[PDB]
Structure formats: structure tokens, C-alpha cells
């Protein structure tokens with residue numbers, strides 16, 4: 001108890017943080033702060049509960065356990081897949097959050113950025129290297145929070161209508177951290193009136209679920225969704241499908257028929273591992289970019305389906321930043337589509353392309369799949385292996401990320417929100433994924449967080465320069481709601497996306513470039529036509 | 536021979552399986568997630584695909 005700068009009293013008790021070394025200076029890190037009672041035993045599948053107060057001074061100088069989850073071991077020793085594996089021990093006792101503040105502590109309420117990690121709602125941890133907020137804190141005087149939330153069955157196994165397995169508890173874990181940030185961020189120097197949520201993939205989808213669920217809507221002011229949305233083919237399931245998957249998983253693990261109460265009771269005697277060993281076997285169709293337990297439309301957290309909610313809510317008070325990377329679908333292909341591997345060029349046959357469309361668009365009818373092949377084929381060169389390979393990538397990315405985002409952008413803008421859109425086109429120089437994958441899902445995260453700002457990490461000067469710009473837009477968006485500049489009339493402006501002009505920008509090494517229409521003709525296919533062909 | 540070893544919940548570590556076969560257990564239909572690796576050659580299950588090797592090191596990759 002010497003550095004009064006690392007000593008903090010939150011409502012729960014006293015905490016002791018740790019001074020960390022960014023590249024230009026030091027930061028106050030308060031790691032492993034328990035924001036809820038461990039959701040184990042009888043609490044499994046249940047809504048989180050506030051952490052009871054503690055006496056004494058709790059040590060907050062380390063990252064806590066990671067929520068029990070599947071570890072992606074497709075490519076042993078490959079950094080592409082392993083940089084996402086948990087980097088701390090797995091435990092159901094995992095509801096802890098982290099806070100980074102500059103060093104010393106700030107003298108005036110600083111704007112807060114809360115990060116929600118992605119990982120298809122089946123994996124993830126706020127303690128991975130890519131989410132290191134020491135950089136945003138040191139370089140932008142940012143106050144950054146990041147929490148752990150249950151994933152997989154623990155975070156989302158549901159039996160809609162039951163009290164012992166209501167569903168969406170992983171999203172509630174998220175909200176509780178949001179509540180925590182409210183009641184305590186002040187003690188660290190963070191303005192509780194300027195909270196900005198931001199996430200990628202499932203994190204971005206989570207963020208969107210917060211905007212859509214009123215209770216969570218009053219705990220933040222702005223939001224950023226990178227490569228993901230609440231609306232879309234994979235972020236949510238119907239209560240019928242949730243129950244379907246929960247009761248099928250239950251069957252697989254020996255639990256046992258079965259009424260809710262006793263089915264869930266049996267599920268709670270089950271070893272964590274045992275649930276994860278069966279998690280991947282309840283999906284309804286052979287597919288990719290599909291996860292077993294995701295948020296469920298329960299009519300509670302989600303009053304109605306995201307689609308409904310985004311065409312009818314009022315987003316006048318909303319300020320959003322949304323975007324996607326160049327090759328949203330690249331690496332998912334490698335998880336089951338005949339012909340794709342990271343090890344070769346993955347050139348495919350028209351026949352493979354046809355088989356691939358069914359796997360990439362798993363819920364599509366024979367007719368819908370048929371329409372997809374039509375749209376994505378270049379009828380001049382209908383068999384060029386390369387074009388087919390790229391088209392497959394595009395099918396998957398457009399269906400799951402690009403078009404759901406454009407739809408979101410559109411609907412929000414069309415309802416009073418001030419939306420800003422982007423496309424991330426810079427492929428990192430250190431990228432270990434094959435060059436054909438371009439700029440893969442999730443590879444803008446490092447730049448936003450500022451990791452190339454670390455001399456210790458191999459990158460180019462351009463890249464470090466690039467990083468700062470991003471760190472800047474985000475934080476400016478974070479504190480003002482506008483990504484631009486409180487002074488120096490930046491010669492290259494980022495205009496808000498509107499249904500009229502549909503402008504958005506390209507984030508890459510070159511200066512900003514303004515473009516119109518997010519894959520406009522293609523997303524009309526996805527968002528306006530296909531849904532009529534599947535009803 | 537050295538091989539990878541792991542469950543659905545652990546990172547891939549490398550171990551000496553001595554002179555036994557190695558295995559790669561993954562989901563047989565998409566999504567083809569790898570469910571585990573280790574020593575031996577446990578029978579496949581049509582729902583779970585199991586490929587086995589005998590050499591060289593890291594062959595169950």
C-alpha cells in the first residue's frame with residue numbers, strides 16, 4: 001500500500017492495481033475485479049448476481065480465469081488460430097472485469113470505452129493480447145473496461161419460459177459489468193456519463209443487443225459494432241430452436257424425457273467439460289459460421305426479434321460507428337467447406353462451389369441456394385477456380401456480416417441515428433493466414449487497440465502511424481460521437497452514413513476515401529429478396 | 536514419435552507417444568471442429584472422424 005495511485009475503493013471494498021509499461025509511459029491496470037458471485041453449482045445457467053462486498057484489500061494485479069469454453073485446435077502451433085485460444089485457466093468462476101487508466105490517474109472525468117469480446121458466443125476472453133488497453137490508456141488518456149462473460153452452454157443454454165434456464169445470461173453478465181462501470185468507474189477517473197460500448201464479431205452483436213434491450217440502453221451513450229450485428233443469420237435463435245438444442249444437448253449428456261426444472265437440475269450435476277464435448281453436435285444443418293448456443297429471442301431481453309426491433313425502435317438518441325473488414329468470410333471456409341485449407345491456394349471446382357454454397361448458407365432452401373449460385377457466378381467465366389474460391393468467400397462474408405451490417409446501418413440511419421460506416425482494407429504485414437484470405441475477420445482489432453505501437457512487435461512504420469489514426473477516430477467517436485477533430489480542420493472528412501447517400505469510408509494506409517453504397521446491389525439481394533423466397 | 540495432445544478444452548501440447556499411433560478426432564460433418572488429439576487410435580464414430588498416423592512427429596496435425 002505505497003502507490004496511492006494504484007489504491008482504489010469501489011463499492012465492494014479496497015482494490016490494489018498494478019503499474020504497467022506501455023511504450024511511451026506507464027498505466028494503472030486493475031485486473032481481475034470480481035463483478036459478480038461465481039455462477040457455478042446451482043447458479044449455472046442462471047442470471048448473474050452482484051458480488052457481495054469484501055473486507056481487506058483485494059489484489060487486482062492479474063488477469064482472472066477464462067470462462068469455460070471450447071479451445072479451437074484446428075491448427076496446432078499456428079498463430080492464426082491460437083492467438084484466440086484462452087491465455088489463462090478455464091473456470092466457471094470467471095465473472096471478472098479489467099480497468100485500464102493512464103498513470104497518474106486523471107484529474108477530470110475521462111470518457112469510458114467498454115470492450116465486449118467476440119468469439120461466436122462459444123469462446124473468448126477479455127485477457128487476450130489483442131484486447132490490451134494499455135495503449136489506448138497511455139496514448140489517448142482512455143479509461144478502458146473489458147469484462148468476461150459466459151459463453152457456450154453456460155452463457156446461453158436456454159429453455160425459454162423456465163426460471164432455472166431463462167437464457168441470455170451471458171448477455172446479462174455483460175450488463176452487470178455495465179452496471180458495475182456505472183456505480184464505480186468514477187473512483188478510477190472515468191466519466192460514468194460518457195460510456196461507449198464497442199465489440200467485434202459476437203462482441204459487436206452483443207453491443208447491438210444492448211442497444212435493443214431497454215434495460216441495457218440506459219447504461220451507455222454510444223456504441224461501436226465491428227464486423228457483427230444482432231440482426232443476422234447467426235447471432236440469435238428462436239425460443240423453439242433454443243429449446244430444441246438445449247433439450248438435445250441434455251439428451252446427449254445423459255439428461256436423462258424431462259420437464260424443465262429436473263432437466264436443468266440434471267444438467268447442473270454435469271461436469272463442465274462434458275457439456276463442451278457435446279456443444280458442437282446440436283447444430284441443425286451441416287454448416288460454418290454457426291454456433292450452438294447464442295442469444296435467444298425470449299421476448300424478455302429481446303422483446304421481439306432483432307429484425308423487428310431495428311425496423312421499429314427510435315434511435316434518435318443513437319450515435320453509432322459500424323464497419324466490416326475486406327474479407328469477412330475468408331477463414332470460416334477452412335472449417336468444413338470441401339476444398340479449403342490454409343495450407344494451399346484453395347482453388348475449387350464449380351462442383352465444389354455448388355456444394356460449398358449449401359454449407360455457407362445452411363438455412364437456405366434448395367431454391368434459395370440456387371439463387372445464391374446465380375448471383376455469385378460470373379457467367380463469362382463460370383468455372384475459373386480462383387473466381388469460385390473468392391466467390392465462396394464473398395458468399396459467406398456477405399451473408400453473415402456485410403449485409404447484416406448494411407441492413408443495420410440502413411435501418412438505424414433511417415430512424416434518426418447518426419451512423420458512421422467503414423470498411424477495413426489493410427492486411428497486416430505479420431499475418432500468418434494465407435494471402436488469398438486477404439483481410440480476415442477480426443484483424444482490425446489489433447490496429448484499433450494500438451498493438452503496433454509496441455516496438456517489441458514486428459510491424460512497419462506506416463502500420464504504427466496507421467494504428468494511431470484508428471486509435472484517434474475511435475476515441476474521438478468515443479468522446480464526442482464524431483470521429484473527426486475539435487479543431488484542425490482535417491482536410492479529409494468522414495461523413496455520416498445516410499439512406500440517401502450511403503457514404504462510408506475506407507480505413508487503410510492511404511488517406512481516407514469516401515465511397516457510396518455498402519455492396520448495395522448485393523445486399524439488396526440478401527436483405528430484400530431472399531427473405532421473400534423463404535416464407 | 537511426438538504428437539499433439541488435447542481435449543475439447545485444452546491447447547495443443549506436444550507429447551511423446553513413444554511407438555503407438557496418434558490420432559486426430561474432429562467433427563465429421565461441417566463445422567469440422569477438431570475435438571481432440573492424443574496417443575492411440577480410438578474407433579471413429581461416423582459423427583466423429585478419427586484419422587490415425589504412425590509417423591513422423593506431429594503427424595496427427
Ligand SMILES: *[C@@H]1O[C@H](CO)[C@@H](O)[C@H](O)[C@H]1NC(C)=O
Pocket residue numbers: 338339340341343344345346347
Ligand atoms: C488443399 O488442401 C486440402 C487438404 O489438405 C485438400 O482437400 C484440397 O484438395 C487441397 N487443394 C489443392 C490445391 O489441391
